[PDB]
Design a binder for this molecule. Sequence first.
Ligand SMILES: CC(C)CCC[C@@H](C)[C@H]1CC[C@H]2[C@@H]3CC=C4C[C@@H](O)CC[C@]4(C)[C@H]3CC[C@]12C
Ligand SMILES: CC(C)CCC[C@@H](C)[C@H]1CC[C@H]2[C@@H]3CC=C4C[C@@H](O)CC[C@]4(C)[C@H]3CC[C@]12C
Ligand SMILES: CC(C)CCC[C@@H](C)[C@H]1CC[C@H]2[C@@H]3CC=C4C[C@@H](O)CC[C@]4(C)[C@H]3CC[C@]12C
Ligand SMILES: CCn1c(=O)c2[nH]c(/N=N/c3ccc(OC)c(OC)c3)nc2n(CC)c1=O
Ligand code: NA
Length: 389
Amino acid sequence: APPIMGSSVYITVELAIAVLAILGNVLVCWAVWLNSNLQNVTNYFVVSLAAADILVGVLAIPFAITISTGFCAACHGCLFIACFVLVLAQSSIFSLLAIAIDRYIAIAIPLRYNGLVTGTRAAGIIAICWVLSFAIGLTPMLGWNNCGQPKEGKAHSQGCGEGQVACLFEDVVPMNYMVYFNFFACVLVPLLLMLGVYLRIFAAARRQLADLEDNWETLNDNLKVIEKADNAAQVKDALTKMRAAALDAQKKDFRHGFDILVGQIDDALKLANEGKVKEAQAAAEQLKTTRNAYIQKYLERARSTLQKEVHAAKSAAIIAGLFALCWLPLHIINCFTFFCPDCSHAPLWLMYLAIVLSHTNSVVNPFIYAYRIREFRQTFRKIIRSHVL
Ligand SMILES: CC(C)CCC[C@@H](C)[C@H]1CC[C@H]2[C@@H]3CC=C4C[C@@H](O)CC[C@]4(C)[C@H]3CC[C@]12C
Ligand SMILES: CC(C)CCC[C@@H](C)[C@H]1CC[C@H]2[C@@H]3CC=C4C[C@@H](O)CC[C@]4(C)[C@H]3CC[C@]12C
Ligand SMILES: CC(C)CCC[C@@H](C)[C@H]1CC[C@H]2[C@@H]3CC=C4C[C@@H](O)CC[C@]4(C)[C@H]3CC[C@]12C
Ligand SMILES: CCn1c(=O)c2[nH]c(/N=N/c3ccc(OC)c(OC)c3)nc2n(CC)c1=O
Ligand code: NA
């Protein structure tokens, strides 16, 4: 069948994806710019990620359409329009890794996050990552390319001029670059590192919630021990274990609650050491008033904060997993082309399906934010209502 027919479908789908990638990710950037509740270090990487996806729509998709025609081009110019998308994919990987690491720092050392992770440091990292993405993605332009061995018969058949080639991705970009350097080293290894970071994030969150409940049970258990003690020495032991636990849970109404708690433990401890068991047990019953009015609120707020961090980490992980889902088919196909030269090449329709799938990843993140992050969803609603209605 005439090639322009299947090419028309491919091109129309690409243009549709490009429109959606621009619109959705412009909306992401507008929301962050407008809403100070969204202006944090994590979302600066989200904006860098949205900028890469905007450029997929504006530049990479037009470049992919161009390079599908096989038009006559100087080989190194053809190389640039083949490789620019690799810059954008690489920048996306760096942003996704940064988001994972940022969330790990927030859950693992929340006390030093704000001093460690600042807007100025994020902006420098983003700048550095974009420079490295150009170096990685344009590495073929530094000589790791097939321009030294042009397909002259294909070029001559298309009427190309001297020094020109038919501009086709797999004719100019070496397959060993795409598989060993781009895929294995620059894509697969960072994604696996991300998986490891996310595993540590979720394991750290689970441990911290288990520790919260352990401290709650230990507090209530030791209260029971004091109640059914029969001498002053048993009361002292439990109060001593309670006091060390109270300080462990301590590191304004929160501070007041723990100030009461430790003080009421010291009061009961002093009576215990005078051998006044009954009087000490009565002092320890006061702890329950402090536990109800203060400690349960501290426990519940800490649990709710920790669960929100789990929720934000799952949302970030969904973004990283969707990047992998959308890009792996094209990379896997390249692996078959490279590692199985006895295999027939994947057919052209599947090539174009794998290409458009990789491009759909630039559409999907705005939907994940809308469905999973209320602050985005509310800002999206207000932008659309005012500025599109
Ligand atoms: C700021 C943005 C919008 C600038 C966009 C510049 C783009 C469109 C330019 C910059 C470099 C250009 C390429 C440089 C060299 C050649 C070789 C020639 O034989 C065919 C055109 C081709 C392949 C050009 C296509 C267009 C190109 C990719
Ligand atoms: C990330 C998830 C969705 C995995 C994706 C699996 C895809 C990319 C795999 C599964 C089956 C694979 C195909 C199985 C057999 C062949 C025949 C060979 O002559 C060319 C490659 C080709 C056509 C493979 C291309 C890649 C392929 C389509
Ligand atoms: C965590 C996961 C996604 C890692 C990625 C898996 C990749 C590296 C694996 C999965 C399936 C594999 C392919 C399965 C079958 C063949 C056919 C053989 O003749 C050459 C190797 C080749 C082409 C493999 C190359 C590597 C491959 C593409
Ligand atoms: C991820 C990088 N990447 C690739 O790895 C990649 N590989 C590839 N292969 N395309 C064809 C193969 C054979 C053909 O005919 C025989 C053909 O005819 C038009 C096209 N396009 C790719 N793109 C899109 C620009 C991309 O972006
Ligand atoms: Na992207």
